[PDB]
Every structure is written in C-alpha cells, then in structure tokens.
Amino acid sequence: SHIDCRMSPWSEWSQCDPCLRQMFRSRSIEVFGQFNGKRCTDAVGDRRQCVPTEPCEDAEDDCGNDFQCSTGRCIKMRLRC
Amino acid sequence: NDAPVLISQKLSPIYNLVPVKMKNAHLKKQNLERAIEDYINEFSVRKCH
C-alpha cells in the first residue's frame, strides 16, 4: 500500500519576538508511512525575520558580583590568575 | 581506517539549514520546503506505470 504522508497541518502566525527577532509559523507531524511508499522526513518548524516592535528592555547583567569573563560567566571567589 | 565510507545516515531537511535573519530567509525557507515537497511527490515509481 502506497501510504502517503498527511504531514502539513499549518497553524496561525504568533506574535513576533522582539529580542530574538524571529517568528513562529508552527506545524506538526501526523503520518509517517509504514510501507515502501513516499518517505517524508519533513522537519517541524519554520522561522521568519520580523521587525521588532517592543524596546527589548530585558537583558542579562554581568552577575553584579565580580570580574566578568569574556563570554558571560563570573568568578565566584578564586577564579583569578 | 585510511578511507572510510558512510554506513548509517540520520537525515534532516535542507530548508532547516538556511541561515536566519537573512534577506528573505523565512519566505525562502517555506519556498524551498514547498520545492522539496513537490520534488519528492512529483516524479517517482508512484507516478510511473
């Protein structure tokens, strides 16, 4: 039996993420295909650039404790030289 | 060991590999998705005799 893949349930566009600058057109997987028919490896997910509307005031501070590293981590007490 | 070859291959669609925040990345993403769907469902043993 040449079972096809019913694998295109589309969803509605969600709100744009201002800080990440991405959209969330959604999808889902329903049918694989048990027999030698059409193989369907279509991955779930879709992205899109979007003009941000929020100021994106949320940000990660440099732990407010000690010397900041070049990547984002911090010295606790003795991570010096 | 000098020259190996593939045995098992885990698969992933190409339209997920397109770089984000490009000129028209999202529309090109869904466009290539429709293209690969039309490719995989266009010509095969299913359509032949």
Curated annotation (Swiss-Prot), chain A:
Glycans are attached at W10, W13. Disulfide bonds join C5-C40, C16-C50, C19-C56, C63-C74. Residues 4-57 form the TSP type-1 domain. It comes from the Eukaryota. This is Complement component C9a. It comes from Homo sapiens. The chain holds residues 39 to 119 of 559 of the full protein.
